[PDB]
Amino acid sequence: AGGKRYDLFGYEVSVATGPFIEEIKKAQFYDDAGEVIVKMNLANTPPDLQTYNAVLERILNCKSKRSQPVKGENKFAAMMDILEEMDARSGIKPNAESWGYVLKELVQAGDFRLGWVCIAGMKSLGITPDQALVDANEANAAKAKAAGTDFPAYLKKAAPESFDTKAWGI
Amino acid sequence: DVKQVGYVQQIIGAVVDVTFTDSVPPVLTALTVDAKETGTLLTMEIVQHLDTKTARCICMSSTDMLRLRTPVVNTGSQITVPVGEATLGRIFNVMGDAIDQRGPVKNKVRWPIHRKAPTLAEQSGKDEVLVTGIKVIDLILPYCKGGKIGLFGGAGVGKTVIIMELINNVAKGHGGYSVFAGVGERTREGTDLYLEMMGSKVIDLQGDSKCVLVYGQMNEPPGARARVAQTALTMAEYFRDEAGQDVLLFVDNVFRFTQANSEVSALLGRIPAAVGYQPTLAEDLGMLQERITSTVKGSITSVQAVYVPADDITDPAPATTFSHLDATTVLSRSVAEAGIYPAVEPLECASRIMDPDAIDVNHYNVAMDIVEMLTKYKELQDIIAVLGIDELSEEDKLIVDRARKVAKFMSQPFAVAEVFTGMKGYYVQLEDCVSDFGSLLMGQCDNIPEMAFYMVGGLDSVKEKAAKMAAEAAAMRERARKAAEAK
Amino acid sequence: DEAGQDVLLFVDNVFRFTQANSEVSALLGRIPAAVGYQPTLAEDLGMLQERITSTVKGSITSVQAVYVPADDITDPAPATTFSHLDATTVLSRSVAEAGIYPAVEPLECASRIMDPDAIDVNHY
Amino acid sequence: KQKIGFVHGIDGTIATIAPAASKVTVPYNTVLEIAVSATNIANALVFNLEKDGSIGVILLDNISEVRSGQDVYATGSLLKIPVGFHMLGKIINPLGKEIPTGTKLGLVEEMAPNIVSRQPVNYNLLTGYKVIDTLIPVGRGQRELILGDRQTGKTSIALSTILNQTKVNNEILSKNNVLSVYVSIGQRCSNVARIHRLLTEYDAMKYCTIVAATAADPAGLQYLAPYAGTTLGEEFRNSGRHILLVYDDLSKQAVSYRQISLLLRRPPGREAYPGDVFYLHSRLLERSAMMSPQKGSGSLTSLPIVETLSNDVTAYIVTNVISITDGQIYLDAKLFTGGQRPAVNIGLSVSRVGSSAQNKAMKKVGGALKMLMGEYRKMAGEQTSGSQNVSPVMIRGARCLQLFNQKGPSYFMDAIVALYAVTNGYMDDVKLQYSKFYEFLLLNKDLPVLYGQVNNKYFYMYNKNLNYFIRYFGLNHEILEPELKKYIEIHTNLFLDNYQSRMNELKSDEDLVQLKNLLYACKRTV
Ligand SMILES: Nc1ncnc2c1ncn2[C@@H]1O[C@H](COP(=O)(O)OP(=O)(O)OP(=O)(O)O)[C@@H](O)[C@H]1O
Ligand SMILES: COCCOCCOCCOc1ccc(C(C)(C)CC(C)(C)C)cc1
């Protein structure tokens, strides 16, 4: 069924990543999921593409990172760090089923600009993004354009003419 | 028959002393204590007798959790190391215990580590040449069989690629295996060197490997690191004697072989003579080198990296090492950044076998003429940047062309990196190489352009590239002419 | 501690404290370290330098002098005193012979409260 | 409890032992509990054994309470400290004793991983400084030295390298969060307090513990500070986490080993050190590694600090650590004084891990900066003190040196764009004085968002969740390249017109000072 996989040094490597995926789907918070990849690695059973994507499913569907809240939390950076880990560190490449989660988060959060980067990147790698989310992203964009939320307010404020260190708010 | 047992009596760092009730074993004899006591196996070699029943022994591992008056088993001999075909494609510590996790090693016999040097009768005074296949080396720096060679290179100068290619060529040309010795090697470089030997198939796990690896790492005490090169060289003396063939012996920096013995001599309490190196400097270094000699039965050549502390050649460790070397393969970042690979700087290099008493006459005169040429090119290079090439006479600009051709012709590819960069490698012979440089020196190949000699091997190989370049440019003209004439 | 007052602690000098124990270390049988100093110099100095420190109760504004023999900063006694200070004022023969007093080399010395926030920005 | 013997003599921190009549064997590196009183105990460690029966011992606590004749009990176990995730917030003592401020045990000396239990370094550790992360990048598992004289920025580099890791580890999963362990050897006890207050100020102590062995502490406790820190890092490796480990500093650690070894009459050597003081730091630094996917893929990085004296590198310890480390950083006081801070000397500073650590967006940029600074030196060295040089190299290089000057770390996004502008010539019309104000407006402010130029769908420098697209696709990618150029071009035109014109017209007394302070504040915040 599953083709052979080998470590750097050539030792045989396990592919039966089945039960660890269920261990991820049961993760109520999306930081206990990342703590499963450690056990998968330590078992000579590294993660597959389907495994990383289960992790992204929980990064999206879960409510918070841990039981208690966290400062500076962000679902998006978590997902993209998984992608930089999948591609650069390990070599596994993402699929449409992965950028889907990455795009749904930017739609839910409403950060419409980064969404267009995901749309412009899925189209560079040869992926067909769902038009539902593209329409929702453009909807949030037009929405924010009406209310001046297109950019924040602190940037549209006029610049100080004086070169005082206090005026610039350093 | 039974085996002898002794009892510890004091522990001071790595040093340990072992009381007996009978005749003490010989010096350099290995003494093992079971792994149940310390938690891991433990070997200590006798160095220094203190009385009729005490035997100071240097320890190669950590002697932590070693109680007093523990039993200590006499091996009956010194450190017996594996030897054979089974050794290849593996890594071994000082004791011959494999550390690559790749199962046991299926060896037949197991030889001791401190073998006496070859007698004078076993020697062969006839100085021979090792056909490296690397024209840059073969022309200017003929690696003498049974000789010691210096390799001066930091980072990003192709040191790894050179030693990999040497292994390959000696495996096919002279039919001889090789062996690596990491003395005080950074444990990161062990991975970066063991994995390069998987992409290059110098270590074909599912096939026939060529080199043995011996890593005595910095995390090991000096009693181990000092006894590493004896291990890697004992692996080579099997191939010299029994297999009856030629061998390379790569030695990560000899500076760290010297430092470790300095540390041993300190721990033993021996008064440091000089800057801090042991009084037994040349002895401990020469007991190693004198085993690296040619024979009637084979040869062991040793390419030795040397670190020069503070760029001072007068320090006793470099200075004593140089007294044993025969050639100096210097590597420079400058030539490397100029596209040349292998990054050898021939003028600052040197050799001992460059004498027609040793080599044939043509090989000598051609090489000395190249040295004259490139030296003159360095001088004229100091003039062109000042005055300009138009300032030079008609005779000078010709050698300014040919010297550039020579320097570009030294650039050679490597079958090691054939997968990485894609280009083939070329094992070029010795005599053919001399006829090539003699053609480029006698001017009978001057119409050929400069860049054709860049990254090729053999005069018979560049001409395909010259034809390829001319055909390509002619096709660009035939493309431009018809693309402009059609419109 | 007791009076809660602020205190000044001038010392001339910290280096003679060091060599006073160096003159004895050979008699004690302690193997001498490099340049002719005791092996326990850094520890012995730290046991004194740490006593010199403000607390919640009060503040000692100590000042220390140090002898740099042969004007060699590499001497371990000054070099070990570096860590134990906040203002490593340094004096030099070259400025002194030029007629400039206090013969301070501003480049070889640097303080701790030379910050942007602790002091005025124009000063910094 | 059953004893082994009684103390026989002490030499400050050193002790000696006389065995009891019941001659009992004692191991070599275990702990000895000395009964200074009925309750209080003075922990210690065996350092040598002898024929007649005696034990030279290093004392780790309660030295003053030691007297000859006391009983001496043995544990029969090596030294070990508390270990786990219940330690990241708190300063400690290398015996694990928590120091105040206004279960699982781990061994201090474990064998480092073998080659098969390791992995080539592939991921970066962002110091926050453009200098390091561009030209001498620090990887994970990449032990890299920090050299320099006193008061150059050594501790500041290792301490800003921690602060950069706070913005991220909050965001990203707790598997890829590089934690940290500061280790003070022989430093003043108030420096530790300032570090505590600083890291607490930036919420950096939730992911950073500290090991404190001050100058008033025993040399044997200064001897084991880095071992304690490393042992804490090792479970993080074994738990798959990433972990950093700083030493301020090792040059004092070697003084402590000298003290111990000489007072216990070990044979001396160069600079009065023993032989195995190279082995001392090899016991330590080799425990740094980038572990294998069979080993959780964790990592322990190292930033060992080593103080030089008069820019000497021929010193014994410096020679040794350079022989051990996977690169080095070299700070210079001649540049620290010349407004160049951090005051690297890029030629002497090396990272043998050149590109395998760098990101996709970083390889191109830093590879251009090498090809810029190597040329900038050949030109800057030969030019006079008075020559005017109008060339793309000297221009771009000088402005880049200004950008390299910054107090405190910098976000990755901020580090790239400011350098992309230079290497591609956008930062050429500006002056060498006003480069940091250009950068301050580019990164934090957004001029085109203000001045109406909004012909850019996504690329702006206010979101800061955008760098995770840069790290993945890279700026050379087709979607980020033109938008990047447009933001930089429009920012440059608006700057050179509106701001750089008003600046040079300020030919007064107090206006120029009001501006000079602004630029020297932009240097700090950026
Ligand atoms: N980029 C920078 N800009 C301005 N000041 C800096 C910068 N980096 C470091 N410094 C200053 O350098 C001084 C010393 O820093 P640090 O304590 O790290 O040096 P050090 O060499 O560890 O000192 P010591 O030798 O006492 O340990 C501090 O006052 C700090 O403000
Ligand atoms: C006549 O034949 C002589 C052949 O000699 C072979 C052995 O040569 C020993 C090498 O000696 C040197 C001398 C100088 C150097 C330099 C000074 C160039 C090394 C340096 C620049 C790294 C300090 C290196 C090796």
Ligand SMILES: [Mg+2]
């Ligand atoms: Mg410091």
